[PDB]
DNA sequence: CTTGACAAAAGTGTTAAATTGTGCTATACTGGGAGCTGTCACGGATGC
């Protein structure tokens, strides 16, 4: 929703972001027609 | 995460575009972009390690 | 002022039909709004009931106010800036306000130019914008599809 | 191997249509911008 600060007139619009790759069955995405995979990453957990 | 930062690039694509102009004709229809977001996420799934 | 099912246009976006009164949470205590709908694009709208007539939410031309607009097309004209910048500016402005008479007039002198001296790739884009919006509200008032409205406009000229 | 005839390939002259290069737009716009990490060893210039 696009709301003007002045007129206080709410103008609501739905838009289209784009095409985001979705996960297949076994858990391997298909990018550029080729079956690919995202390997898990690891790092020291945030904190003190 | 990549959605967060990429959509922040799109946020640049929002806050900057909505002031060059006339508030008269205005709506996220013309204010919303794609390539920053869509290509950010397109970038995560390929060129990333 | 605006009743539930009043068929009116909410410029610049285009024609549509409103729907009703709502309380949408904005700032402090919820103020009444007109939920206003639109035909093709699926998005809602909320127009403040405070001063909806001065905010740019206006009525739709009656079925009897068509010939004045068609005449503002066929023979209609208006002064336009010399420098291309200011010309584009004014075209955009009239394409903002939503005033049907004004837009028809602008489209009149602009169209008059397209058929005579020529038209740029800018002024013509705005011109087509005008003709399309005209097609929208002339379709809404006369209860006809956009074909017959655009055919009224093509009747003005040929 | 030779002469004339002649079709096409090729040469040249002149234009129409396209491509490309230039200048300017006047309300007022007047000091960016984005972040990143979990070595290690030694050699040299430099600040103590």
Swiss-Prot record, chain B:
Domain of life the protein comes from: Bacteria
UniProt family annotation: Belongs to the RNA polymerase beta chain family.
What this chain does, per the entry, is described as: DNA-dependent RNA polymerase catalyzes the transcription of DNA into RNA using the four ribonucleoside triphosphates as substrates.
On subunit structure and binding partners, the annotation says: The RNAP catalytic core consists of 2 alpha, 1 beta, 1 beta' and 1 omega subunit. When a sigma factor is associated with the core the holoenzyme is formed, which can initiate transcription.
Report the protein name in the record. Answer: DNA-directed RNA polymerase subunit beta
The taxonomic lineage of its organism, from the top, reads: Bacteria, Thermotogati, Deinococcota, Deinococci, Thermales
- Span within the full-length protein is 342 to 390 of 1119
